[PDB]
C-alpha cells in the first residue's frame, strides 16, 4: 500500500539515459506502467529493452501536437490514460532552443495530458528542472516553476497535482568530463560536499507521484545538498 | 525491498500524543523506525507507549528545560541508541509563549541531538510548522533557522528540513461553524482539508536515506494554499 | 542631488500609454533624458509630443536585432549611451506570443544595452512585469525574474544593476471595462482594498533607476497592496 | 517639488546612535521628517539630539519594557504628533537575547504605534534586518511577522515592509583581517561593501507617500548576495 504505483500509467520524457532513465526505472520498481520516450525510434527501442514487462519505449516529438496526440492515443489504447507525467530536461538560437526544450515543450505536453487526468479527478504532473552548470537555463527553469504554480492552482480542485523537482549538481555523463580542477569548484558551492545521484532525483519524483503526495501541489522540491 | 526503510533508525517525535504528531510516529514505526514519541506529562507518555507497543515508547519531555532534554536523550541513547531522526512537531503572554513553543524549543532540541548525529555522519532533523501573526513569526523563524543550520551541517551528513502544513483535519475543525468551514476551504484550491497522514508522509520521506541530498528545504503540504 | 537622474539617458519601451507613459514622464521629472518607444512611427510621434525637450519618441521592433542596433546607435548619436533601460509589458499562438512579448524581447533588449553599460561601469536595467488579470503570463513573468536574477549576478561586478518591478492590480484603460460585479472580486483579492496607480509603478522604477539604488540588484520589487 | 517629501511626518528610528540607524535618521531629516532617534541610554539620546538639531531629537528607549514604550510614544505624541513612520532598526544567553533584540522588540514596538496610525489611515512601519543561525532565525521571524501584520493592516492605510541589508561598511569591518575582507567580498557579486546611506535610501523610499502600494515586501540591499 505505502507509495505503491501499481495501477498507474507513467509517461517519462527523456527516458533514454541518466535522470530520465533513473526515474523510469524507479517508477517501474514502485509498480507503475512506464512509457519512457525518446526523440527517435531507436532510442525508444533501447528504452523498451531496459523496461521489459514493466512498460515500453515510444518515439515522441514534443514540438509536434500530432506526435503528442498519437502517442497519448497509443498509450490510452494499450495501457489506459496517463496518470503520471514526468517532464525531463550565446546566439539568438541557444536562447530560443532552451526556451523550446526547457519550457514550451513542458507547457504543451502538460496541457495535453490534463484533459484525461481531470476526467478521472486524478493525476500527477512533475517537471524536472535542468541540472546546474546560465541566463537561458535560469529563465526557462524559473518559467517552468512559474507555470507549475499557476497550473497547480487551476487544477487542484480536480484531483491533479502539478509540482517541480529542481536538481542541484548531479553526477552524470557530462559532469565526469569536468577536470579535477573544475570538480572542486563545483563541490565548493555545495554544502553537502558531494554531487547528487540521479536516483535521488528519481526518489523525489516518485514520492510526489505517489497517492501519499495528493495534498502537495505547486511546490518546487529542491534536491541540491544545500546549494540554494 | 530497501525502499525508504527506516529499520535501524531511532526517531524522536515531539508532540506525539494526537493528530499530526501521532500520525507521524505511527508511520515512522510502519517504516521500521524505533519511535520515541513525547508528551509534556507522564500520562500522555503512557498513552504514546500503548499505541506504539514493541516499535518504541513514550517519554515525558519539557523542551523549555535543558536538563529535561539532557535526561531524555541519555535515556534514549541508553535503551535505543542515539537519535537518528528528530521530528520537532509542536498581549505579551500570547507572544512569548508562541516564540518558546514554536521556535526556541525547536532550536534547543535541534542543537542537542546534533552532537551525536555529526559523530555518525548521519541524521535527519525535520521541523513541522504550525497548522494554518505570532504564528507567522515563529514559523518563519523555524524556516530561517532550518536554512542556516542546514548549511552548517550538510557537510557532516545531517539534513535539516521543514514541512509546512496548510489546513489539516483535526479536533479543532469539528468546531468550525456551518459556513466557517466553507470560508476556510475557499482559500485552499484543492477544495479539501489535508489529512494528518499526509503530513506524516512528507516527514517520513524526508526522514528516508533516499532524501539525503534534500536539506534546507521547506516542503509545503497545503493543497495549493500559499 | 537626492534621486536625481540629470545626466542619465533612459530607454523606456512601451511608452505610448499607461504604465509605460507614467514611467517615461516621471524619469523626465527626475532629470533623465527619456527616449520612449512604440512599435510604429505614429506612436513615436505621440511620445515625442508629451516629452518635449526632455527627450523623444522612437519606433522600435524588439523582435528585430537590426531595429535594436539602429535605435541604440541613434540614441548614442543624439544623447549618449543608454544608462537606464526599462522593459515594459488558449492556442499555441497565445503562448508563443506571450513568451515573445513578455520574455524573449526582455532578454534580447537587455543583452543589447549591456555592452555600453559595462564599458561605463554604470547602468540600470529594470523589467516591469505584467499587471495581473494566467499560465502564460505567469510563465513569462517568472521567466523574467529568473533571467533578471542570473543576469544580475553576472554583471554586478561591472556597475550595472538588473531588477524587476512586479505590479499587482493597477488602474488602467482595461481595468475600468470590468463591470461593478467584476470590480469587487478584484478588490477582494487586495489587502489594501484598492487598485494601484500607474504612478506607483513609476515611483518604484525611478527609485531603482537612481544612483541611490546602486547596491540593489537581482531584486523583485512588488507593488501590489499586499496581494502576494 | 512634492516628490518623496516627508514634511509633516514624524519618524521614530530605533538604534539611531551610529552607522545605519544614524544614516537613516539623517536622511529622513533631509527629506523633511521630524525624526526622533533612539538609544538605550540618556547619553546616547543626547548625542542623537546634537546631530539632528532642529529636525528632531534623541530619546532614551528600552524596547524590552512596555512602560518605556508607552512613555516615549506619549512624549512624542505630546511634542510632535503621533508617530507616522516607525523604523525598527537594531549557549542560551546568545539565543534568547537575539530573539528579544531582533524580533520581540520589533513586534512590540510595531504593535504599539499601530493604534495611532490606523486612526489616521496613514502609517509606515519599516524593519531593518541585521547586517550579514540565531540571526537567521530572528531575521526570518521579522519578515514572517512583517508579512502577517502587512496583510492585517493594509486596508487601513498602513504599510509594513522589511529592508534586508547584505554586507555593509561599519565600525565592525575595520577589524576584518587582510584576506578576511577578501573572503567576505567573494560572496558579494557587486565586489564591494554597501554603504549605510544605501540602507537609508531604501528605508526613505518605502517611507514615502510614493510607496503606499508597497506592503509586505522584503527589500534586499545586498549587491547580489542572496
Curated annotation (Swiss-Prot), chains B, D:
Origin superkingdom: Bacteria
UniProt-listed NCBIfam families: 3oxo_ACP_reduc (TIGR01830), PRK05653.1-1 (NF004197), PRK07231.1 (NF005559), PRK12824.1 (NF009464), PRK12826.1-2 (NF009466)
Binding positions (NADP(+)): 15-18, 40, 62-63, 89, 135-139, 168
Active site per UniProt: 135 (proton acceptor)
Keyword Electron transport belongs to the record: no
Catalyzed reaction equations: a (3R)-hydroxyacyl-[ACP] + NADP(+) = a 3-oxoacyl-[ACP] + NADPH + H(+)
Molecular function via GO: 3-oxoacyl-[acyl-carrier-protein] reductase (NADPH) activity; NAD binding; NADP binding; oxidoreductase activity, acting on the CH-OH group of donors, NAD or NADP as acceptor
Enzyme class: oxidoreductase
Name of the molecule in the record: 3-oxoacyl-[acyl-carrier-protein] reductase FabG
PROSITE patterns according to UniProt: ADH_SHORT (PS00061)
Pathway assignment: Lipid metabolism; fatty acid biosynthesis
Residue stretches spanning the membrane: none
Source species of the chain: Vibrio cholerae serotype O1 (strain ATCC 39315 / El Tor Inaba N16961)
Family listed: Belongs to the short-chain dehydrogenases/reductases (SDR) family.
Subunit comment: Homotetramer.
Annotated InterPro entries: 3oxo_ACP_reduc, NAD(P)-bd_dom_sf, Sc_DH/Rdtase_CS, SDR, SDR_fam
Biological processes annotated in GO: fatty acid elongation
Keywords: Fatty acid biosynthesis, Fatty acid metabolism, Lipid biosynthesis, Lipid metabolism, NADP, Oxidoreductase
SMART domains: PKS_KR
Binding locations of substrate: 130
